[PDB]
Design a protein around this ligand. Structure first.
Ligand SMILES: Cc1cn([C@H]2C[C@H](O)[C@@H](COP(=O)(O)O)O2)c(=O)[nH]c1=O
Ligand SMILES: Cc1cn([C@H]2C[C@H](O)[C@@H](COP(=O)(O)O)O2)c(=O)[nH]c1=O
Ligand SMILES: [Cl-]
Ligand SMILES: [Cl-]
Ligand SMILES: [Mg+2]
Ligand SMILES: [Mg+2]
Ligand SMILES: [Mg+2]
Ligand SMILES: [Mg+2]
Ligand SMILES: [Mg+2]
Ligand SMILES: [Mg+2]
Ligand SMILES: [Mg+2]
Ligand SMILES: [Mg+2]
Lengths: 188, 187
């Protein structure tokens, strides 16, 4: 039971605002909700480790993955088991976009790591707030953000049932209404 | 060129003393040497975090792997590139023994994770300091340690061209001499 939803996008895309808005919206309907986030929902100390100077992209991903593994096991799966709507502000797609398309790590390896880390748990829907890259860890420059932005769009084209792509430049309340509309058939 | 060697075993198996004796031997022969260790050779902060917290074995392994990825890139490969003999007290086999055999994680997955983390770097020889957990110099709790001990022995018998298994209960100087004898053909 339960319903697993995620929000994705660049830094500054509004996906945090929308995750919180959505949690409150659902709670106002009387639904049990668990709002969480990555990095840090699993292992809060990972945020310290991720700041390490000159971190290799492989190490970077492995840190995100350690947090994710703890997050899935200790937070998300137990929430879903209790019938909650679990909303994560970022999940595996963030790694695929940032560490895969951004840093250049091989997607198949990212997925193999992830398969045990996540126990195969995938969100039902993922709301991608698509932000122009100039409107957006070391080396987070414009070239990187272009790769990440386009990578997210690629992920969305590859799983077009799961991803809902939203124009992050729209007013926050219009974005929220669009998210709500996509959810109504799942949450009567 | 360099030469990459590792030491493995339970904590308190002497592998730490033997790493020091081996580096001293090599220093006496005028051979440049770098001694290092896991966890913490890559990300000290991982070592200190794992000292005081316990996680799922998957998360545990992924933290050891992040440390290892940094260790290989920033410490081991540069030492080998300079022509040093690099000796690590613990490497990937520790994860296989502790997280794999001990905590039950699947070995093929561990090895797939590792393949990128390590850039495929494997030691030329690994000295396993074998002893029962009750003999380690540093009972339901013993079951985990026996799984790890037996896991190391299983790793060793699968790769008899890489592992050298030593009686860790022997006197320290005798173990060191046996390590030296195994190494001399490779120098
Ligand atoms: C979850 C996740 C986030 N990130 C990035 C997105 C943001 O730049 C940053 C999160 O920083 P924050 O903890 O300050 O919000 O980490 C990744 O690179 N990969 C991931 O897997
Ligand atoms: C390198 C490594 C160590 N360990 C454990 C074995 C010991 O319990 C501990 C050694 O840490 P310490 O020597 O820093 O105290 O780390 C693993 O479980 N897996 C690993 O991959
Ligand atoms: Cl945001
Ligand atoms: Cl030891
Ligand atoms: Mg992952
Ligand atoms: Mg997601
Ligand atoms: Mg794969
Ligand atoms: Mg031990
Ligand atoms: Mg590893
Ligand atoms: Mg080894
Ligand atoms: Mg065993
Ligand atoms: Mg055995």
């Amino acid at each position: 039971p339960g319903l697993f939803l995620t929000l994705e996008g660049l830094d500054g895309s509004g996906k945090t605002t929308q995750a919180r808005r959505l949690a409150a919206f659902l709670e106002a309907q009387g639904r049990p909700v668990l709002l969480t986030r990555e990095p840090g929902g699993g292992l809060p100390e990972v945020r310290s480790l991720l700041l390490t100077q000159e971190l290799s992209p492989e190490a970077e991903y492995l840190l995100f993955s350690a947090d994710r593994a703890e997050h899935v096991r200790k937070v998300i799966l137990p929430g879903l088991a209790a019938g909650k709507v679990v909303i994560s502000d970022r999940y595996l797609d963030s790694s695929l976009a940032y560490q895969g398309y951004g840093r250049g790590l091989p997607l198949p390896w990212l997925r193999e790591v992830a398969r045990e880390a996540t126990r195969g748990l995938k969100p039902r829907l993922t709301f991608l707030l698509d932000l122009p890259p100039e409107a957006a860890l070391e080396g987070l420059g414009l070239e990187f953000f272009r790769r990440v932005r386009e990578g997210y769009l690629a992920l969305a084209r590859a799983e077009p049932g799961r991803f809902v792509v939203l124009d992050a430049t729209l007013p926050e309340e219009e974005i929220a209404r669009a998210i709500q509309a996509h959810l109504r058939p799942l949450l009567p």
